[PDB]
mmCIF file of N, CA and C and ligand atoms in Angstrom:
data_model
loop_
_atom_site.group_PDB
_atom_site.id
_atom_site.type_symbol
_atom_site.label_atom_id
_atom_site.label_comp_id
_atom_site.label_asym_id
_atom_site.label_seq_id
_atom_site.Cartn_x
_atom_site.Cartn_y
_atom_site.Cartn_z
ATOM 1 N N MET A 1 -66.417 -144.398 197.787
ATOM 2 C CA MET A 1 -67.669 -144.149 198.346
ATOM 3 C C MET A 1 -67.226 -142.830 198.483
ATOM 4 N N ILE A 2 -68.596 -141.912 198.610
ATOM 5 C CA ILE A 2 -68.776 -140.739 198.851
ATOM 6 C C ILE A 2 -70.039 -140.829 200.374
ATOM 7 N N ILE A 3 -69.494 -140.173 201.038
ATOM 8 C CA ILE A 3 -70.395 -139.524 202.150
ATOM 9 C C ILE A 3 -71.246 -138.253 202.132
ATOM 10 N N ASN A 4 -72.187 -138.086 202.169
ATOM 11 C CA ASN A 4 -72.780 -136.753 201.808
ATOM 12 C C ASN A 4 -73.302 -136.212 203.342
ATOM 13 N N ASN A 5 -73.260 -134.444 203.122
ATOM 14 C CA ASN A 5 -74.051 -133.988 204.243
ATOM 15 C C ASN A 5 -75.252 -133.160 203.708
ATOM 16 N N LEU A 6 -75.825 -133.294 202.632
ATOM 17 C CA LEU A 6 -76.728 -132.861 201.956
ATOM 18 C C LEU A 6 -78.210 -132.341 202.972
ATOM 19 N N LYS A 7 -78.251 -133.333 203.694
ATOM 20 C CA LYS A 7 -79.517 -133.410 204.337
ATOM 21 C C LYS A 7 -79.438 -132.343 205.517
ATOM 22 N N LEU A 8 -78.198 -132.246 206.151
ATOM 23 C CA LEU A 8 -77.902 -131.733 207.307
ATOM 24 C C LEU A 8 -77.849 -129.914 206.821
ATOM 25 N N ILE A 9 -77.134 -129.910 205.873
ATOM 26 C CA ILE A 9 -76.895 -128.454 205.292
ATOM 27 C C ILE A 9 -78.397 -127.924 204.750
ATOM 28 N N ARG A 10 -79.272 -128.516 203.953
ATOM 29 C CA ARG A 10 -80.217 -128.231 203.702
ATOM 30 C C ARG A 10 -81.250 -127.957 205.001
ATOM 31 N N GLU A 11 -81.452 -128.740 205.742
ATOM 32 C CA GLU A 11 -82.107 -128.306 207.068
ATOM 33 C C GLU A 11 -81.658 -127.055 207.480
ATOM 34 N N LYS A 12 -80.389 -127.047 207.851
ATOM 35 C CA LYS A 12 -79.811 -125.885 208.726
ATOM 36 C C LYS A 12 -80.209 -124.556 208.059
ATOM 37 N N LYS A 13 -80.156 -124.544 206.543
ATOM 38 C CA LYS A 13 -80.717 -123.470 205.856
ATOM 39 C C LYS A 13 -82.128 -123.103 205.831
ATOM 40 N N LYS A 14 -82.846 -124.286 206.503
ATOM 41 C CA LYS A 14 -84.347 -124.129 206.714
ATOM 42 C C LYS A 14 -85.045 -124.199 205.336
ATOM 43 N N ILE A 15 -84.418 -125.097 204.189
ATOM 44 C CA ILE A 15 -84.873 -125.085 203.136
ATOM 45 C C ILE A 15 -85.531 -126.821 202.960
ATOM 46 N N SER A 16 -86.873 -126.608 202.511
ATOM 47 C CA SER A 16 -87.479 -127.923 202.517
ATOM 48 C C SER A 16 -87.032 -128.773 201.144
ATOM 49 N N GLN A 17 -87.484 -129.977 201.249
ATOM 50 C CA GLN A 17 -86.953 -130.838 199.948
ATOM 51 C C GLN A 17 -87.793 -130.176 198.859
ATOM 52 N N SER A 18 -89.057 -129.884 198.806
ATOM 53 C CA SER A 18 -89.801 -129.423 197.609
ATOM 54 C C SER A 18 -89.232 -128.160 197.323
ATOM 55 N N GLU A 19 -88.786 -127.101 198.610
ATOM 56 C CA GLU A 19 -88.273 -125.934 197.992
ATOM 57 C C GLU A 19 -86.839 -126.369 196.721
ATOM 58 N N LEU A 20 -86.025 -127.165 197.685
ATOM 59 C CA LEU A 20 -84.679 -127.342 196.738
ATOM 60 C C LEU A 20 -85.031 -128.185 195.322
ATOM 61 N N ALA A 21 -86.001 -128.903 195.468
ATOM 62 C CA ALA A 21 -86.297 -129.710 194.209
ATOM 63 C C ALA A 21 -86.760 -128.294 193.325
ATOM 64 N N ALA A 22 -87.531 -127.586 193.446
ATOM 65 C CA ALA A 22 -87.967 -126.587 192.823
ATOM 66 C C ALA A 22 -86.945 -125.529 192.229
ATOM 67 N N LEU A 23 -85.959 -125.528 193.153
ATOM 68 C CA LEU A 23 -84.794 -124.177 192.790
ATOM 69 C C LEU A 23 -83.992 -125.174 191.794
ATOM 70 N N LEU A 24 -83.555 -126.321 191.895
ATOM 71 C CA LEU A 24 -82.940 -127.352 191.103
ATOM 72 C C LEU A 24 -83.368 -127.616 189.930
ATOM 73 N N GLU A 25 -84.695 -127.619 189.637
ATOM 74 C CA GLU A 25 -85.446 -127.922 188.974
ATOM 75 C C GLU A 25 -85.263 -129.608 188.494
ATOM 76 N N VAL A 26 -85.326 -130.455 189.678
ATOM 77 C CA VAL A 26 -85.269 -131.835 189.940
ATOM 78 C C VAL A 26 -86.553 -132.179 190.915
ATOM 79 N N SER A 27 -86.926 -133.564 190.711
ATOM 80 C CA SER A 27 -87.920 -134.220 191.878
ATOM 81 C C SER A 27 -87.476 -134.041 193.282
ATOM 82 N N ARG A 28 -88.522 -134.000 194.092
ATOM 83 C CA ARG A 28 -88.347 -134.038 195.342
ATOM 84 C C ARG A 28 -87.763 -135.783 195.762
ATOM 85 N N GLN A 29 -88.082 -136.618 194.790
ATOM 86 C CA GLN A 29 -87.582 -138.020 194.890
ATOM 87 C C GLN A 29 -86.002 -137.873 194.805
ATOM 88 N N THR A 30 -85.819 -137.320 193.822
ATOM 89 C CA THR A 30 -84.482 -137.085 193.705
ATOM 90 C C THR A 30 -83.621 -136.604 194.925
ATOM 91 N N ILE A 31 -83.987 -135.687 195.485
ATOM 92 C CA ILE A 31 -83.294 -135.170 196.542
ATOM 93 C C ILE A 31 -83.362 -135.896 197.701
ATOM 94 N N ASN A 32 -84.681 -136.723 198.102
ATOM 95 C CA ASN A 32 -84.810 -137.394 199.015
ATOM 96 C C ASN A 32 -83.847 -138.736 198.853
ATOM 97 N N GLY A 33 -83.683 -139.140 197.403
ATOM 98 C CA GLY A 33 -82.649 -140.352 197.320
ATOM 99 C C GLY A 33 -81.421 -140.442 198.002
ATOM 100 N N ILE A 34 -80.880 -138.885 197.121
ATOM 101 C CA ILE A 34 -79.758 -138.544 197.729
ATOM 102 C C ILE A 34 -79.435 -138.583 199.147
ATOM 103 N N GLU A 35 -80.222 -137.717 199.583
ATOM 104 C CA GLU A 35 -79.958 -137.725 201.316
ATOM 105 C C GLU A 35 -80.375 -139.248 201.855
ATOM 106 N N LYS A 36 -80.967 -140.161 201.363
ATOM 107 C CA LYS A 36 -81.296 -141.535 201.904
ATOM 108 C C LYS A 36 -80.133 -142.449 201.396
ATOM 109 N N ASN A 37 -78.893 -141.937 200.798
ATOM 110 C CA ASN A 37 -77.902 -142.776 200.366
ATOM 111 C C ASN A 37 -78.397 -143.881 199.570
ATOM 112 N N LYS A 38 -79.523 -143.577 198.587
ATOM 113 C CA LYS A 38 -79.647 -144.431 197.638
ATOM 114 C C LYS A 38 -78.801 -144.554 196.391
ATOM 115 N N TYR A 39 -78.343 -143.159 196.004
ATOM 116 C CA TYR A 39 -77.202 -143.171 194.882
ATOM 117 C C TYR A 39 -76.748 -141.830 194.990
ATOM 118 N N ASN A 40 -75.554 -141.666 194.183
ATOM 119 C CA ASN A 40 -74.984 -140.295 194.175
ATOM 120 C C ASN A 40 -75.453 -139.440 192.743
ATOM 121 N N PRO A 41 -75.616 -138.302 193.195
ATOM 122 C CA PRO A 41 -76.217 -137.373 191.901
ATOM 123 C C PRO A 41 -74.974 -137.145 190.554
ATOM 124 N N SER A 42 -75.485 -136.789 189.613
ATOM 125 C CA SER A 42 -74.476 -136.694 188.480
ATOM 126 C C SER A 42 -73.730 -135.468 188.781
ATOM 127 N N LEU A 43 -72.375 -135.332 188.109
ATOM 128 C CA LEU A 43 -71.738 -134.258 188.413
ATOM 129 C C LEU A 43 -72.437 -132.945 188.184
ATOM 130 N N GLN A 44 -73.465 -132.806 187.140
ATOM 131 C CA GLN A 44 -73.839 -131.542 187.325
ATOM 132 C C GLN A 44 -74.678 -130.994 187.932
ATOM 133 N N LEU A 45 -75.416 -132.127 188.792
ATOM 134 C CA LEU A 45 -76.410 -131.925 189.715
ATOM 135 C C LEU A 45 -75.747 -131.624 191.053
ATOM 136 N N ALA A 46 -74.659 -132.298 191.333
ATOM 137 C CA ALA A 46 -73.761 -132.089 192.612
ATOM 138 C C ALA A 46 -73.338 -130.506 192.355
ATOM 139 N N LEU A 47 -72.967 -130.231 191.059
ATOM 140 C CA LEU A 47 -72.505 -128.641 190.934
ATOM 141 C C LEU A 47 -73.422 -127.546 191.357
ATOM 142 N N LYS A 48 -74.619 -127.899 190.857
ATOM 143 C CA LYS A 48 -75.982 -126.898 190.980
ATOM 144 C C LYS A 48 -76.265 -126.893 192.416
ATOM 145 N N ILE A 49 -76.092 -128.001 193.364
ATOM 146 C CA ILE A 49 -76.368 -128.139 194.764
ATOM 147 C C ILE A 49 -75.462 -127.205 195.336
ATOM 148 N N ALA A 50 -74.060 -127.261 194.914
ATOM 149 C CA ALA A 50 -72.930 -126.495 195.851
ATOM 150 C C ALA A 50 -73.176 -125.109 195.406
ATOM 151 N N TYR A 51 -73.749 -124.794 194.026
ATOM 152 C CA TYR A 51 -73.795 -123.557 193.592
ATOM 153 C C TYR A 51 -74.793 -122.872 194.687
ATOM 154 N N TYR A 52 -76.075 -123.384 194.622
ATOM 155 C CA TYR A 52 -77.192 -122.587 195.168
ATOM 156 C C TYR A 52 -76.922 -122.633 196.600
ATOM 157 N N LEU A 53 -76.356 -123.723 197.169
ATOM 158 C CA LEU A 53 -76.179 -123.683 198.730
ATOM 159 C C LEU A 53 -75.002 -122.758 198.996
ATOM 160 N N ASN A 54 -74.116 -122.136 198.314
ATOM 161 C CA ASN A 54 -73.479 -121.564 198.748
ATOM 162 C C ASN A 54 -72.054 -122.031 199.444
ATOM 163 N N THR A 55 -72.131 -123.396 199.198
ATOM 164 C CA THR A 55 -71.159 -124.325 200.048
ATOM 165 C C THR A 55 -70.129 -125.139 199.205
ATOM 166 N N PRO A 56 -68.699 -125.063 199.595
ATOM 167 C CA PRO A 56 -67.856 -125.947 198.925
ATOM 168 C C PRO A 56 -68.522 -127.399 198.397
ATOM 169 N N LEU A 57 -68.379 -127.530 197.208
ATOM 170 C CA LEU A 57 -68.867 -129.264 196.745
ATOM 171 C C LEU A 57 -68.249 -130.081 197.619
ATOM 172 N N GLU A 58 -67.128 -130.048 198.113
ATOM 173 C CA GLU A 58 -66.422 -131.076 198.916
ATOM 174 C C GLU A 58 -66.866 -130.962 200.446
ATOM 175 N N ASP A 59 -67.490 -129.839 200.891
ATOM 176 C CA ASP A 59 -68.068 -129.990 202.363
ATOM 177 C C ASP A 59 -69.567 -130.718 202.137
ATOM 178 N N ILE A 60 -70.055 -130.767 200.896
ATOM 179 C CA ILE A 60 -71.402 -131.449 200.677
ATOM 180 C C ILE A 60 -71.332 -133.068 200.306
ATOM 181 N N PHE A 61 -70.242 -133.385 199.214
ATOM 182 C CA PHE A 61 -70.072 -134.794 199.015
ATOM 183 C C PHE A 61 -68.564 -134.701 198.919
ATOM 184 N N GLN A 62 -68.397 -135.938 200.007
ATOM 185 C CA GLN A 62 -67.033 -136.115 200.524
ATOM 186 C C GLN A 62 -66.525 -137.611 199.907
ATOM 187 N N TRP A 63 -65.618 -137.737 199.033
ATOM 188 C CA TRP A 63 -65.241 -138.941 198.715
ATOM 189 C C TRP A 63 -64.234 -139.299 199.896
ATOM 190 N N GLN A 64 -64.102 -140.596 200.185
ATOM 191 C CA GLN A 64 -63.400 -141.096 201.194
ATOM 192 C C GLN A 64 -62.124 -141.809 200.721
ATOM 193 N N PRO A 65 -60.900 -141.055 200.443
ATOM 194 C CA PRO A 65 -59.790 -141.545 200.107
ATOM 195 C C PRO A 65 -59.585 -143.196 200.037
ATOM 196 N N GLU A 66 -59.350 -143.788 198.932
ATOM 197 C CA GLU A 66 -58.669 -145.148 198.761
ATOM 198 C C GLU A 66 -57.988 -145.399 197.527
ATOM 199 N N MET B 1 -74.557 -124.456 181.417
ATOM 200 C CA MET B 1 -72.914 -125.023 180.923
ATOM 201 C C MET B 1 -72.192 -125.463 181.961
ATOM 202 N N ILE B 2 -71.261 -126.396 181.458
ATOM 203 C CA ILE B 2 -70.119 -126.571 182.504
ATOM 204 C C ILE B 2 -68.589 -126.093 181.911
ATOM 205 N N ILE B 3 -67.892 -125.409 182.461
ATOM 206 C CA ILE B 3 -66.575 -125.013 181.738
ATOM 207 C C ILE B 3 -65.734 -126.052 182.693
ATOM 208 N N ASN B 4 -64.594 -126.274 181.719
ATOM 209 C CA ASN B 4 -63.732 -127.410 181.910
ATOM 210 C C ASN B 4 -62.286 -127.009 181.871
ATOM 211 N N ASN B 5 -61.465 -127.090 183.257
ATOM 212 C CA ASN B 5 -60.088 -126.578 183.246
ATOM 213 C C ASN B 5 -59.207 -127.530 183.587
ATOM 214 N N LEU B 6 -59.588 -128.733 183.423
ATOM 215 C CA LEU B 6 -58.797 -130.162 183.693
ATOM 216 C C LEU B 6 -57.565 -129.914 183.081
ATOM 217 N N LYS B 7 -57.514 -129.643 181.718
ATOM 218 C CA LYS B 7 -55.949 -129.710 181.049
ATOM 219 C C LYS B 7 -55.164 -128.453 181.726
ATOM 220 N N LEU B 8 -55.668 -127.477 181.868
ATOM 221 C CA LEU B 8 -55.096 -126.457 182.075
ATOM 222 C C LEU B 8 -54.440 -126.525 183.459
ATOM 223 N N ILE B 9 -55.228 -127.110 184.700
ATOM 224 C CA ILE B 9 -54.979 -127.075 185.943
ATOM 225 C C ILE B 9 -53.599 -128.657 185.876
ATOM 226 N N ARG B 10 -54.120 -129.685 185.313
ATOM 227 C CA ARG B 10 -53.050 -130.840 185.161
ATOM 228 C C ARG B 10 -51.692 -130.258 184.796
ATOM 229 N N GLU B 11 -51.793 -129.387 183.546
ATOM 230 C CA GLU B 11 -50.473 -129.080 183.111
ATOM 231 C C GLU B 11 -49.610 -128.082 183.857
ATOM 232 N N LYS B 12 -50.226 -127.244 184.638
ATOM 233 C CA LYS B 12 -49.623 -126.224 185.530
ATOM 234 C C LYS B 12 -48.672 -127.283 186.788
ATOM 235 N N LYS B 13 -49.433 -128.128 186.933
ATOM 236 C CA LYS B 13 -49.091 -128.960 188.215
ATOM 237 C C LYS B 13 -47.927 -130.142 187.636
ATOM 238 N N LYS B 14 -47.689 -130.112 186.011
ATOM 239 C CA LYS B 14 -46.911 -130.957 185.546
ATOM 240 C C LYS B 14 -46.888 -132.525 185.808
ATOM 241 N N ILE B 15 -48.415 -132.894 185.431
ATOM 242 C CA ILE B 15 -48.531 -134.128 186.032
ATOM 243 C C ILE B 15 -49.106 -134.824 184.498
ATOM 244 N N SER B 16 -48.496 -135.609 184.143
ATOM 245 C CA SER B 16 -48.934 -136.256 182.519
ATOM 246 C C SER B 16 -50.379 -136.816 182.588
ATOM 247 N N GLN B 17 -50.877 -136.982 181.237
ATOM 248 C CA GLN B 17 -52.269 -137.560 181.533
ATOM 249 C C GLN B 17 -51.972 -138.985 181.983
ATOM 250 N N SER B 18 -50.837 -139.866 181.647
ATOM 251 C CA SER B 18 -50.527 -141.126 181.974
ATOM 252 C C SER B 18 -50.483 -141.246 183.419
ATOM 253 N N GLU B 19 -49.833 -140.323 183.986
ATOM 254 C CA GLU B 19 -49.553 -140.377 185.688
ATOM 255 C C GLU B 19 -50.908 -140.103 186.292
ATOM 256 N N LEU B 20 -51.883 -139.269 185.862
ATOM 257 C CA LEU B 20 -53.315 -139.199 186.488
ATOM 258 C C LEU B 20 -54.111 -140.204 186.113
ATOM 259 N N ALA B 21 -53.969 -140.867 184.751
ATOM 260 C CA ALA B 21 -54.982 -141.769 184.576
ATOM 261 C C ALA B 21 -54.393 -142.918 185.526
ATOM 262 N N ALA B 22 -53.344 -143.173 185.712
ATOM 263 C CA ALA B 22 -52.784 -144.129 186.831
ATOM 264 C C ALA B 22 -53.057 -144.131 188.130
ATOM 265 N N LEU B 23 -53.129 -142.967 188.548
ATOM 266 C CA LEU B 23 -53.641 -142.796 190.029
ATOM 267 C C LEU B 23 -54.972 -142.774 190.216
ATOM 268 N N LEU B 24 -56.016 -142.570 188.950
ATOM 269 C CA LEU B 24 -57.458 -142.817 188.676
ATOM 270 C C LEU B 24 -57.848 -144.208 188.629
ATOM 271 N N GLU B 25 -56.581 -145.029 188.005
ATOM 272 C CA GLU B 25 -57.316 -146.228 187.543
ATOM 273 C C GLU B 25 -58.347 -146.471 186.451
ATOM 274 N N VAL B 26 -58.160 -145.028 185.428
ATOM 275 C CA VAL B 26 -58.833 -145.120 184.165
ATOM 276 C C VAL B 26 -57.856 -145.197 183.084
ATOM 277 N N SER B 27 -58.493 -145.323 181.920
ATOM 278 C CA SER B 27 -57.681 -145.231 180.520
ATOM 279 C C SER B 27 -57.271 -143.880 180.562
ATOM 280 N N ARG B 28 -56.090 -143.449 179.853
ATOM 281 C CA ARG B 28 -55.588 -142.371 179.585
ATOM 282 C C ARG B 28 -56.699 -141.705 178.342
ATOM 283 N N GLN B 29 -57.080 -142.434 177.625
ATOM 284 C CA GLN B 29 -58.098 -142.137 176.542
ATOM 285 C C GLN B 29 -59.542 -141.182 177.390
ATOM 286 N N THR B 30 -59.927 -141.679 178.477
ATOM 287 C CA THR B 30 -60.968 -141.338 179.533
ATOM 288 C C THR B 30 -60.428 -139.808 179.666
ATOM 289 N N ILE B 31 -59.238 -139.747 180.168
ATOM 290 C CA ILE B 31 -58.807 -138.452 180.995
ATOM 291 C C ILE B 31 -58.766 -137.582 179.804
ATOM 292 N N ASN B 32 -58.140 -137.918 178.649
ATOM 293 C CA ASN B 32 -58.175 -137.002 177.377
ATOM 294 C C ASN B 32 -59.417 -136.366 177.029
ATOM 295 N N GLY B 33 -60.400 -137.520 176.969
ATOM 296 C CA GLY B 33 -61.793 -137.300 176.696
ATOM 297 C C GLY B 33 -62.454 -136.112 177.556
ATOM 298 N N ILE B 34 -62.159 -136.193 178.566
ATOM 299 C CA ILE B 34 -62.948 -135.321 179.524
ATOM 300 C C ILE B 34 -62.355 -133.803 179.481
ATOM 301 N N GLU B 35 -60.668 -133.916 179.028
ATOM 302 C CA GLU B 35 -60.087 -132.655 179.050
ATOM 303 C C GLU B 35 -60.361 -131.925 177.973
ATOM 304 N N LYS B 36 -60.912 -132.688 176.550
ATOM 305 C CA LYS B 36 -61.338 -132.177 175.231
ATOM 306 C C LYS B 36 -63.059 -131.901 175.418
ATOM 307 N N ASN B 37 -63.574 -132.082 176.402
ATOM 308 C CA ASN B 37 -64.943 -131.966 176.854
ATOM 309 C C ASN B 37 -65.877 -132.670 176.217
ATOM 310 N N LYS B 38 -65.488 -134.020 175.672
ATOM 311 C CA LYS B 38 -66.351 -135.060 175.079
ATOM 312 C C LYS B 38 -67.317 -135.712 175.875
ATOM 313 N N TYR B 39 -67.258 -135.668 177.200
ATOM 314 C CA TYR B 39 -68.033 -136.162 178.144
ATOM 315 C C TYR B 39 -67.534 -135.614 179.399
ATOM 316 N N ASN B 40 -68.357 -136.173 180.451
ATOM 317 C CA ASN B 40 -68.295 -135.514 181.846
ATOM 318 C C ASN B 40 -68.026 -137.047 182.561
ATOM 319 N N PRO B 41 -67.286 -136.890 183.588
ATOM 320 C CA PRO B 41 -67.129 -138.147 184.509
ATOM 321 C C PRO B 41 -68.247 -138.268 185.641
ATOM 322 N N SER B 42 -68.234 -139.248 186.166
ATOM 323 C CA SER B 42 -69.013 -139.477 187.696
ATOM 324 C C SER B 42 -68.761 -138.524 188.229
ATOM 325 N N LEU B 43 -69.776 -138.058 189.328
ATOM 326 C CA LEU B 43 -69.371 -137.478 190.630
ATOM 327 C C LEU B 43 -68.095 -138.166 191.080
ATOM 328 N N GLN B 44 -68.038 -139.353 191.631
ATOM 329 C CA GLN B 44 -67.108 -139.890 192.195
ATOM 330 C C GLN B 44 -65.568 -139.538 191.446
ATOM 331 N N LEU B 45 -65.560 -140.122 190.026
ATOM 332 C CA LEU B 45 -64.410 -140.005 189.477
ATOM 333 C C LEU B 45 -64.052 -138.281 189.326
ATOM 334 N N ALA B 46 -64.937 -137.443 189.396
ATOM 335 C CA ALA B 46 -64.575 -136.107 189.516
ATOM 336 C C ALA B 46 -63.659 -135.470 191.042
ATOM 337 N N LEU B 47 -64.774 -136.383 191.858
ATOM 338 C CA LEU B 47 -63.987 -136.177 193.185
ATOM 339 C C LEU B 47 -62.461 -136.875 193.362
ATOM 340 N N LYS B 48 -62.388 -137.774 192.749
ATOM 341 C CA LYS B 48 -60.960 -138.306 192.657
ATOM 342 C C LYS B 48 -59.981 -137.352 192.113
ATOM 343 N N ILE B 49 -60.348 -136.930 190.738
ATOM 344 C CA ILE B 49 -59.388 -135.958 189.829
ATOM 345 C C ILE B 49 -59.149 -135.101 190.787
ATOM 346 N N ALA B 50 -60.352 -134.375 191.396
ATOM 347 C CA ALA B 50 -59.885 -133.144 192.382
ATOM 348 C C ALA B 50 -58.904 -133.497 193.585
ATOM 349 N N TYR B 51 -58.998 -134.488 194.047
ATOM 350 C CA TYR B 51 -58.228 -135.191 195.121
ATOM 351 C C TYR B 51 -56.636 -135.190 194.580
ATOM 352 N N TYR B 52 -56.559 -135.733 193.714
ATOM 353 C CA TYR B 52 -55.302 -136.115 192.774
ATOM 354 C C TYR B 52 -54.536 -134.874 192.471
ATOM 355 N N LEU B 53 -55.481 -133.774 191.815
ATOM 356 C CA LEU B 53 -54.744 -132.601 191.647
ATOM 357 C C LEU B 53 -54.755 -131.569 192.724
ATOM 358 N N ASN B 54 -55.144 -131.977 193.892
ATOM 359 C CA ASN B 54 -55.225 -131.294 194.699
ATOM 360 C C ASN B 54 -55.809 -129.837 194.839
ATOM 361 N N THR B 55 -56.991 -129.944 194.281
ATOM 362 C CA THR B 55 -57.555 -128.338 193.629
ATOM 363 C C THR B 55 -59.104 -128.850 194.020
ATOM 364 N N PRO B 56 -59.863 -127.753 194.645
ATOM 365 C CA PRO B 56 -61.508 -127.566 194.781
ATOM 366 C C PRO B 56 -61.988 -128.376 193.287
ATOM 367 N N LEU B 57 -62.841 -129.171 193.408
ATOM 368 C CA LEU B 57 -63.769 -129.473 192.277
ATOM 369 C C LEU B 57 -64.264 -128.535 191.213
ATOM 370 N N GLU B 58 -64.612 -127.322 192.271
ATOM 371 C CA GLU B 58 -65.434 -126.270 191.160
ATOM 372 C C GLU B 58 -64.583 -125.521 190.649
ATOM 373 N N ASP B 59 -62.868 -125.291 190.837
ATOM 374 C CA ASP B 59 -61.784 -124.859 189.885
ATOM 375 C C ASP B 59 -61.786 -125.721 188.811
ATOM 376 N N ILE B 60 -62.142 -126.913 188.699
ATOM 377 C CA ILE B 60 -61.784 -127.630 187.702
ATOM 378 C C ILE B 60 -63.147 -127.739 186.636
ATOM 379 N N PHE B 61 -64.433 -128.072 187.450
ATOM 380 C CA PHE B 61 -65.565 -128.088 186.669
ATOM 381 C C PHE B 61 -66.603 -126.967 187.149
ATOM 382 N N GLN B 62 -66.996 -125.736 186.620
ATOM 383 C CA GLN B 62 -67.735 -124.741 186.687
ATOM 384 C C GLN B 62 -68.844 -124.678 186.088
ATOM 385 N N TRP B 63 -70.156 -124.992 186.994
ATOM 386 C CA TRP B 63 -71.248 -124.829 186.306
ATOM 387 C C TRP B 63 -71.796 -123.486 186.380
ATOM 388 N N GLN B 64 -72.322 -123.015 185.562
ATOM 389 C CA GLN B 64 -72.986 -121.716 185.217
ATOM 390 C C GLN B 64 -74.654 -121.902 185.084
ATOM 391 N N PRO B 65 -75.257 -121.134 185.693
ATOM 392 C CA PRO B 65 -76.950 -121.167 184.993
ATOM 393 C C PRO B 65 -77.190 -120.464 183.964
ATOM 394 N N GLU B 66 -77.865 -120.973 183.040
ATOM 395 C CA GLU B 66 -78.258 -120.019 181.754
ATOM 396 C C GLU B 66 -77.037 -120.384 181.007
HETATM 397 NA NA1 LIG C 1 -65.319 -127.108 194.941
#
């Protein structure tokens, strides 16, 4: 299980869902889906998110060790 | 593009493919495949690799735009 903090980090930076989607070249539905915990992103999308949000990836997507 | 440093990092830490595969509960072939850049892991598997290698995920898998 991964717990994500994307909503909070995105909102803190004052970035809307459509703004982030446009930067990452994905759909708003994709961003919203991640934030509503419907599913995890691909490795590549996770890495793009961390890159542009200038935040260590593990601050955004936290695997609960098991 | 994704730069992949898994082999280099695993090797410096003197963890065999077999031992890493066992911690991750995947085939050794799967670790080998990821090391040789044949395919990418899911995000969760990537986070587990980072956990067992005690290394930030972005030092193992480095995405660069363009
Ligand atoms: Na990282």
